[PDB]
């Protein structure tokens, strides 16, 4: 699964998730799957959406993944009390703001793309929509 | 469990700001290294403390080929 | 590079002299010629100036770049200053290592008067 | 050049085979009798060949002399 090969630090503060996104244009492909909502995308959710949309084009054209999960998320074991240090890293996420183009496709017809991205979207916790390039 | 340590804060920073009237001796900045450089009528201590060498008013300025920050006493 | 290596070599003393706010007698020497000037504390205003390019000084000299041209310049300037109003002064090697021609200039100026 | 740290460096005479003689400065401290100067040398003079290859057929016709 997508995951930094290594990091300066093991654990990160929670932080917040305010703001609108940077990366709102289809930059590589012809079609993209843009995020309307706000939330976290886990490595697993990314891999599951990626497999869905691959399989329904039968490895024709080219898929970019624009987001990458580089925020580690810790959890406390079951039946342990509060305190005694921060928990252990369990999975990784990417922070999504409204506007973040998530995936890009190219080299297939628009109506196929539509159906590929519709499937991948059923695997995602965030409301998404379909987008195209713009001359400018 | 392996963490839980820290040192005592040193109250570094500017003690006298631009335009303030000071007496000879008064400390202007406490700092680590010369984040500010002593200018006219200003000394530099062994822990890079800048102090007024003559009664007057504090003045900051940027000067020189490196764009360094200087502190001087106008003897107003 | 020579001049860069020289300018660098001078700058510490040049700057010290600023802070102290001293009238400085500043030298300069090349193969053929030696020069002197005395600059106002601001560092931007010459007061008196003497060299082996002014015809008046040169017409004596066997050669304009030696330890005797030095003494000539190392006197003209000291006369022209003591008669102006300038007794106390600080000497400025300016990279050149206090020796030979540069030192010759200086010694002569201590004879005339200039109190450094 | 610093004083009294370097070895003695002096005139000598260097007489080759081919009579060639050259006054030269060196430490060696006495006259040489050398055997191959830059004049006495195959390479400098233009002599050395490069070993004759491709003799097998010349060889064979020189060796036997047969119709």
């Amino acid at each position: 699964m997508l995951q930094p090969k290594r990091t300066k630090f093991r654990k990160m503060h929670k932080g917040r998730n305010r703001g609108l996104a940077q990366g709102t244009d289809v930059s590589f492909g012809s079609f993209g799957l843009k995020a309307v909502g706000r939330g976290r995308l886990t490595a697993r959710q990314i891999e599951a959406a990626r497999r869905a949309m691959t399989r329904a084009v039968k490895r024709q054209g080219k898929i970019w993944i624009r987001v990458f999960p580089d925020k580690p998320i810790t959890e406390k074991p079951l039946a342990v009390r509060m305190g005694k240090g921060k928990g252990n890293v369990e999975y990784w996420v990417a922070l999504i703001q409204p506007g973040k183009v998530l995936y890009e496709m190219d080299g297939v017809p628009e109506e196929l793309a539509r159906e590929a991205f519709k499937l991948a979207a059923a695997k995602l916790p965030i409301k998404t929509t379909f987008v195209t390039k713009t001359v400018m | 469990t392996r963490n839980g340590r820290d040192s005592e804060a040193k109250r570094l920073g500017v003690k006298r700001f631009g335009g303030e009237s000071v007496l000879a001796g008064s400390i202007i900045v406490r700092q680590r290294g010369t984040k500010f450089h002593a200018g006219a009528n200003v000394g530099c201590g062994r822990d890079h403390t800048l102090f007024a060498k003559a009664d007057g008013k504090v003045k900051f300025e940027v000067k020189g080929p490196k764009n360094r920050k200087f502190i001087s006493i106008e003897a107003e | 590079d020579k001049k860069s290596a020289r300018i660098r070599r001078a700058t510490r003393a040049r700057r010290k002299l600023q802070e102290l706010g001293a009238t400085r007698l500043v030298v300069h020497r090349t193969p053929r010629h030696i020069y002197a000037q005395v600059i106002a504390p601001n560092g931007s205003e010459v007061l008196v100036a003497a060299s082996t390019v002014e015809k008046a000084i040169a017409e004596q000299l066997k050669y304009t770049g030696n330890k005797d041209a030095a003494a000539a310049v190392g006197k003209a300037v000291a006369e022209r200053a003591l008669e102006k109003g300038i007794k106390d002064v600080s000497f400025d090697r300016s990279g050149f290592q206090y020796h030979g021609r540069v030192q010759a200039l200086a010694d002569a100026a201590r004879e005339a008067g200039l109190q450094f | 050049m610093k004083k009294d740290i370097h070895p003695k460096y002096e005139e000598i005479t260097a007489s080759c085979s081919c009579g060639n003689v050259m006054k030269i400065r060196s430490t060696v401290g006495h006259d040489l009798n050398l055997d191959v100067c830059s004049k006495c040398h195959p390479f400098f003079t233009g002599k050395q060949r490069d070993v004759a290859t491709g003799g097998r057929v010349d060889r064979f016709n020189k060796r036997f002399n047969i119709p």
Binding site: - | - | - | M1, K2, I5, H6, P7, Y9, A14, M22, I24, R25, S26, T27, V28, L32, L34, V36, C37, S38, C40, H41, P42, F43, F44, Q48
Partner: protein, 177 residues
């Protein structure tokens, strides 16, 4: 000066024509010669390195500098500052003199010759060159030798381009292959 002299009339004036150097200053001259000989086997026993020194002093006519490792390397198990070689810079009278000797005595004693290379140039025009044994120089005396030992010999020049150098060398009848 032999070749300094030869340089100052014969060499300069030939090269003068064949490149069309308007200014004479444009003509390549030889700046300096330098004779390195690294002696790693020093870290083993330090006597060896000094024993080199005398060789290089006997060849060249002046005491060598003793060089030391710039950084530590574990590859050769050395640490920054141990003496591991020695050089001599040659610049004037002596430089032209040794050069004379090199051509007209030393180099035609190379155990089986075929001239020297004309490929060994840095790209700006400074000729580098090794010597496998040090009996080549009659300065040493072969029955008073501890070890066979070598050196680099690098001729630093004011030549601009690789090519322009080669010319300067050749014009001293330098034995290239």
């Amino acid at each position: 000066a032999k070749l300094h002299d030869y340089y100052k009339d014969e060499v300069v004036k030939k090269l003068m024509t064949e490149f069309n150097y308007n200014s004479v200053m444009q003509v390549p001259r030889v700046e300096k010669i330098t004779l390195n000989m690294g002696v790693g086997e020093a870290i083993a026993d330090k006597k060896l390195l000094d024993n080199a020194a005398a060789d290089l002093a006997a060849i060249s006519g002046q005491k060598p500098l003793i060089t030391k490792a710039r950084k530590s390397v574990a590859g050769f198990k050395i640490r920054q500052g141990y003496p591991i070689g020695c050089k001599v810079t040659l610049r004037g009278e002596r430089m032209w003199e040794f050069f004379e000797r090199l051509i007209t005595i030393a180099v035609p004693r190379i155990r089986d010759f075929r001239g020297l290379s004309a490929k060994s140039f840095d790209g700006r025009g400074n000729y580098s060159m090794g010597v496998r044994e040090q009996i080549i120089f009659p300065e040493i005396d072969y029955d008073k030798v501890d070890r066979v030992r070598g050196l680099d010999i690098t001729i630093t020049t004011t030549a601009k381009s690789d090519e322009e150098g080669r010319a300067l060398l050749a014009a001293f009848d330098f034995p290239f292959r």
